Design a protein around this nucleic acid. Structure first.
Lengths: 133, 126, 37, 176, 192, 136
RNA sequence: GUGCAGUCGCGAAGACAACCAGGAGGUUGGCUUAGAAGCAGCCACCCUUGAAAGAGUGCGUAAUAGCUCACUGGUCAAGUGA
RNA sequence: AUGGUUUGGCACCUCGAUGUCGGCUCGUCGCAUCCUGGGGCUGGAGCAGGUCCCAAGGGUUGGGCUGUUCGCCCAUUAAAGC
C-alpha cells in the first residue's frame, strides 16, 4: 500500500524507485517489466500506480489515470505553469474538452455526474491559475 | 451544532421518515470513509443510509410519526430509509454487514410495529 | 535546562507550571525544558 | 470535584475502621493505614461505599477533597488485588536474577548491583531480562521501580538500560 | 428603520463644578448636558453602565428617550468627551429633538471587503456627514468592495443610502483607495 | 534614517515630559495602532528598528504609518571634557512622546500577524505601550 | 498566583475534558524541483461522496513513509473558555 | 538594569603634612569559579568536548626581557582564576 507517479516507458531513476519502495524488499525486475509492458500498451501519460503488499510480500499493482494538472498541460495548451495563479491568466479552456476530461474523471474520481466532475477539475484549474471560461 | 441548524436536522428526520416507507436505525462500529464510499457509490441509487446525533433526535423524535421509538436512543443513530421496496433495504444492510463484518442492525420498525432480530431476518426472507 | 527570565511554550505541547516558587516549562522535548532563576 | 464527589465501591471482605479521621482498611492482603486532615469529613456511604465531605468550597478544600478520594480508592483497590509493575531489561549481555528476596543485575559495570527488599514488596523475575515488582503501596512500588530505572544513565542511541514495560523511549543516531 | 430609542433615568444636578463632577464619575455616574432649541440648558447625571450599553448597542449617534424629573424628554447624542488612556466617558452633550426634524449627523462607514489577491485597501476616512430624520439615523454605512481590481477610487457620491437621507460632505472625497499592493522591497522605501 | 533637512535653531532646550496628549490620541490611517503610556524621548534609530521589525514580520504587503518625526535635537559634547565652555553639538534627534499619543499604524488583514508584529515593535522601544484598534 | 467589578464566546438540542472509531478522492495544486509530495521558500488557497476532513497546525523522514492534530458522531455528565 | 575595579565629571573632609608605581614578606575576604566534586541539553557514537545550574573546603609552579602593572615567550602542570 504505497503510491507513486511513474513515467510511461522508462525505469530506474533512483528516488522514484528505490527509497520509497525499493527498500521494502519487493523486487525490481518483475514489477518493472510487467509494468513497462502494460504502460506501453497504454502509452498514454505518466501513469500513477499503487502497490498493495500483503503479509508475504505479495504485491498487487493498481494503475490509475494521470494527474489533472498534467491533463491540462497536454490538453489546455498550458505548456508551463503560471508562477502567479489568478494574476497571469494565459489559459482559456473549453467546457467541451473539460467535459471529456469529466467523463474520464467520472470513471476515476468521486464525481457525482459529468457536471460535478467538470466542476471538480475546473476547481483544480482555479487553484493552479487556469481560467476555464 | 447551532440551534436552528439542529431544528433543520429535526426537519430532515421528519421529512425523511414521513417521505420514506421503511425506517431502521443500525450501527457502524468498525466501518470507515472508504467503506461508506463503496456503499453510497453502489446502493446510492435508491437507498438512504446516513448518521445523525442521538441527543438531537431526542428532540426531533416528536415531530414525525415515530411516537413508539422513544427508548432506542442508546447507540449511535445510523438511519436507514428506503423509498421503494421493503425487502431490499435490510437484506442489503446484511450484504454490506457481511462484506465488512462490522455493521450491526439494532432492531426492526416498519409502519409503527416493532420488529426484532429474527423478525428482520424474516423480513430479509419473505 | 535553559535558565532565563523569559520562558514560553515554544511548541504546542510545552505546558507552563509552577514548582516551589519557580516557573517551569515541561515538555516531552528536552530542548524545550526551561525555568526562571 | 468530579472525582472528589464520587462514592467509592467496597467489595465483600473489606473492613474499614473509621476511627474519626484516621482510617484503616483490612483485607486479605494486609491492613493498610491512612490519615487525613481535620477539615474534611470521612462519611461512610451506607450503601456499601465511602464518601468524602467538605464544609467549604475554598482552594484548600477543592484541592484536598479529591486527593483523599483518589488515595482511598487506590487503597481498597490494592488490598483487593494489589499492584504489580513490569520492567524489562534491554541490552547486550545484560541480565537479571534473584537471590531469595533480593535482586541482582548485570549492567555493564565492573561490579554487580543488588537491592534490599523493603517491608511490603517482593520481586518476581520471569526471565533474565524481564521481571516485575509486586506490592500494595503504590507509592512504594513506583518508588523502587524508578530507583531501578535510574541505575543506568540513559542511552538513546542503542537502547540500553531499564524500561517500564510500555516505555516508548526516545532515540537518535550517532552515525559516525 | 424601526428604532427602539433607549430609555434612561436622569436627574438634574445640585452642584455644577469640577469637584462634584469627579465625585460623580467616581460614584459611577457621568455628567451630561442637554440643550438645543429647548433654550433651557439642563445639567444631568446619567449612569455610565447603562449609557455604555446604549452606545455599544446602537452606535454612538443614537437617539434617547430620557426621563427627567419624572417627566420624559427626547434627545440625541451630538458629542462625546472621552479620556485617552482610560477610555472612560467623561461628559456627553445631548441635543433635544422633536420628531420630523432635519439635523446634521456624522456616522461611520463599514468596509465589507474581500478583494482580488493583488489588492490592498486604504480607508482614508471613517466619518461622513449626513442629514436625515430624527428617528432614522443609520449606524453603519455599509460599503462593499468585491470583484473590483486595482485602482478604484470609491468616491463618497457612490454609497447607497436610505430613502430621505442626503449626503452633505462633498462628493470629492476618497472614502477608500484601492492601492496597487506593495512589494516586500517597497516596504523598505517608506519612511526612511 | 529620519532627520530634517534643516532646522532654524540647531541647539534647543530639552523637551518637556509633563502632561498628556492633545493630538494623536486616535488612530487615523490604518487599523491596528500603537499607543504610549509614559513620557519618553524617542529617537531616529529606535523607529528605524521598529519599522524594520514590522516589515520583516509581515514580509509581503501591508502598510505602515509613522505618525512621529524626530524634529527636536539633543546635544552631546565631546568626551572627557570638564563641564563648562559652551554647549555641545547636535548628534541625535528625538521626538517627544506624551502618553495617549499614537506612534504606528498598520494595515494588514489578519489580526494574528498584525498584533504580533506590533508587539515585536514594542519590544524595540523604551516605553510601556499597548495596542489599539480603531474602534471605540 | 490569587480576591473584586466588568463585557464577550459557548452550554441537559449535553458545554470544556476524556476515552472507542473516523480523520476521504482530485493531488506528488503550480513555480522552484537535485528533493519542493499538507509541511526552506514564492503564488493561488477553489470543487465533490460525506457525519466530518485545513491547499492541511506541529514532530519526523535528504524526498516519501509515519506519529499525529483542525474539523465529526458515540458512553457518562454541569458549567467552561476569552 | 547591575557592580563601582577602569579613563573621566563634582570639589564635600584633610595643604599649622592623610608619605606617593612596582617588588618582597604576611594575610584575610567575595564569587561574576582555573582545576578537583555533583549535575541538565546537545549538531553528545566512544575518547575529548561546547553551553547552562548549584558549589568557596582546599589548592591555584618555577623561569627569560622590561623599573615596570599589563603582556609575549620557554618548560611543566590535575590547574597555572578574577
Amino acid at each position: 500500500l504505497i503510491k507513486l507517479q511513474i513515467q510511461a516507458g522508462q525505469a530506474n531513476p533512483a528516488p522514484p524507485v528505490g527509497p520509497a519502495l525499493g527498500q521494502h524488499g519487493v523486487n525490481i525486475m518483475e514489477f518493472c517489466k510487467a509494468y513497462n509492458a502494460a504502460t506501453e500498451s497504454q502509452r498514454g501519460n505518466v501513469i500513477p500506480v499503487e502497490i498493495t503488499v500483503y503479509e508475504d510480500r505479495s504485491f498487487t499493482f493498481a494503475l490509475k489515470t494521470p494527474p489533472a494538472a498534467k491533463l491540462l498541460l497536454k490538453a489546455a495548451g498550458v505548456q508551463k505553469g503560471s508562477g502567479e495563479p489568478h494574476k497571469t491568466k494565459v489559459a482559456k479552456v473549453t467546457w467541451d474538452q473539460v467535459r471529456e476530461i469529466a467523463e474520464t474523471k467520472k470513471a476515476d474520481l468521486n464525481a457525482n455526474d459529468i457536471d460535478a466532475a467538470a466542476k471538480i477539475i475546473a476547481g483544480t484549474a482555479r487553484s493552479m491559475g487556469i481560467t476555464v471560461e | 451544532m447551532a440551534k436552528a441548524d439542529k431544528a433543520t436536522a429535526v426537519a430532515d428526520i421528519a421529512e425523511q421518515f414521513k417521505a420514506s416507507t421503511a425506517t431502521v436505525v443500525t450501527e457502524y462500529r468498525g466501518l470507515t470513509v472508504a467503506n461508506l464510499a463503496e456503499l453510497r457509490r453502489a446502493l446510492g441509487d435508491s437507498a438512504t443510509y446516513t448518521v445523525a446525533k442521538n441527543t438531537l433526535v431526542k428532540r426531533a423524535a416528536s415531530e414525525a410519526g415515530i411516537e413508539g421509538l422513544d427508548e432506542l436512543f442508546a447507540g449511535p443513530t445510523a438511519i436507514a430509509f428506503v423509498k421503494g421496496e421493503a425487502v431490499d433495504a435490510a437484506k442489503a444492510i446484511k450484504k454490506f454487514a457481511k462484506d465488512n463484518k462490522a455493521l450491526v442492525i439494532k432492531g426492526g420498525y416498519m409502519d409503527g410495529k416493532a420488529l426484532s432480530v429474527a423478525d428482520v431476518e424474516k423480513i430479509a426472507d419473505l | 535546562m535553559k535558565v532565563n527570565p523569559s520562558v514560553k511554550p515554544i511548541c504546542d505541547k510545552c505546558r507552563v507550571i509552577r514548582r516551589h516558587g519557580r516557573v517551569m516549562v515541561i515538555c516531552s522535548d528536552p530542548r524545550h525544558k526551561q525555568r526562571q532563576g | 470535584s468530579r472525582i472528589g464527589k464520587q462514592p467509592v465501591p467496597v467489595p465483600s471482605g473489606v473492613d474499614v475502621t473509621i476511627n474519626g479521621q484516621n482510617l484503616s482498611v483490612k483485607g486479605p492482603k494486609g491492613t493498610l493505614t491512612l490519615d487525613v486532615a481535620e477539615p474534611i469529613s470521612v462519611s461512610r456511604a451506607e450503601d456499601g461505599a465511602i464518601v468524602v465531605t467538605r464544609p467549604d468550597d475554598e482552594r484548600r478544600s477543592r484541592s484536598l477533597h479529591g486527593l483523599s478520594r483518589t488515595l482511598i480508592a487506590n487503597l481498597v483497590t490494592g488490598v483487593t488485588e494489589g499492584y504489580t509493575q513490569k520492567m524489562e531489561i534491554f541490552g547486550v549481555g545484560y541480565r537479571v536474577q534473584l537471590k531469595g528476596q533480593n535482586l541482582e543485575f548485570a549492567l555493564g559495570y565492573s561490579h554487580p548491583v543488588l537491592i534490599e527488599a523493603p517491608e511490603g514488596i517482593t520481586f518476581a523475575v520471569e526471565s533474565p531480562t524481564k521481571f516485575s515488582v509486586s506490592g500494595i503501596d503504590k507509592q512504594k512500588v513506583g518508588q523502587i521501580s524508578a530507583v531501578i530505572r535510574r541505575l543506568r544513565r540513559p542511552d538513546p542511541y542503542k537502547g540500553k538500560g531499564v524500561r517500564y514495560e510500555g516505555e516508548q523511549i526516545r532515540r537518535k543516531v550517532g552515525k559516525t | 428603520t424601526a428604532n427602539i430609542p433607549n430609555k434612561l433615568t436622569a436627574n438634574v444636578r445640585t452642584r455644577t463644578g469640577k469637584g462634584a463632577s469627579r465625585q460623580a464619575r467616581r460614584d459611577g455616574k457621568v455628567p451630561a448636558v442637554l440643550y438645543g432649541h429647548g433654550t433651557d440648558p439642563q445639567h444631568l447625571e446619567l449612569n455610565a453602565r447603562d449609557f455604555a450599553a446604549v452606545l455599544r448597542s446602537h452606535g454612538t449617534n443614537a437617539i434617547l428617550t430620557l426621563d427627567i424629573e419624572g417627566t420624559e424628554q427626547l434627545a440625541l447624542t451630538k458629542a462625546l468627551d472621552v479620556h485617552p488612556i482610560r477610555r472612560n466617558i467623561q461628559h456627553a452633550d445631548l441635543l433635544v429633538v422633536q420628531r420630523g426634524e432635519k439635523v446634521t449627523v456624522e456616522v461611520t462607514v463599514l468596509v465589507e471587503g474581500d478583494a482580488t489577491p493583488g489588492t490592498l485597501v486604504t480607508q482614508d476616512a471613517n466619518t461622513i456627514e449626513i442629514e436625515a430624520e430624527a428617528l432614522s439615523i443609520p449606524e453603519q454605512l455599509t460599503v462593499s468592495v468585491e470583484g473590483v481590481e486595482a485602482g478604484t477610487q470609491i468616491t463618497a457620491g457612490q454609497i447607497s443610502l436610505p430613502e430621505g437621507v442626503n449626503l452633505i460632505s462633498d462628493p470629492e472625497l476618497l472614502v477608500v483607495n484601492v492601492v496597487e499592493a506593495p512589494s516586500a522591497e517597497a516596504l523598505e522605501e517608506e519612511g526612511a | 534614517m529620519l532627520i530634517p533637512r534643516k532646522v532654524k535653531h540647531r541647539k534647543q532646550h530639552h523637551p518637556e515630559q509633563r502632561g498628556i496628549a492633545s493630538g494623536g490620541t486616535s488612530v487615523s490611517f490604518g487599523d491596528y495602532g500603537i499607543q504610549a503610556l509614559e513620557h519618553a524621548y524617542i529617537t531616529n534609530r529606535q523607529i528605524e528598528s521598529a519599522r524594520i521589525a514590522i516589515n520583516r514580520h509581515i514580509k509581503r504587503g501591508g502598510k505602515v504609518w509613522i505618525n512621529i518625526f524626530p524634529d527636536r535635537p539633543l546635544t552631546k559634547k565631546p568626551a572627557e571634557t570638564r563641564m563648562g565652555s559652551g554647549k555641545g553639538s547636535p548628534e541625535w534627534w528625538v521626538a517627544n512622546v506624551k502618553p495617549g499619543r499614537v506612534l504606528f499604524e498598520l494595515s494588514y488583514p489578519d489580526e494574528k500577524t498584525a498584533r504580533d508584529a506590533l508587539t515585536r515593535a514594542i519590544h524595540k522601544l523604551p516605553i510601556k505601550a499597548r495596542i489599539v484598534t480603531r474602534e471605540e
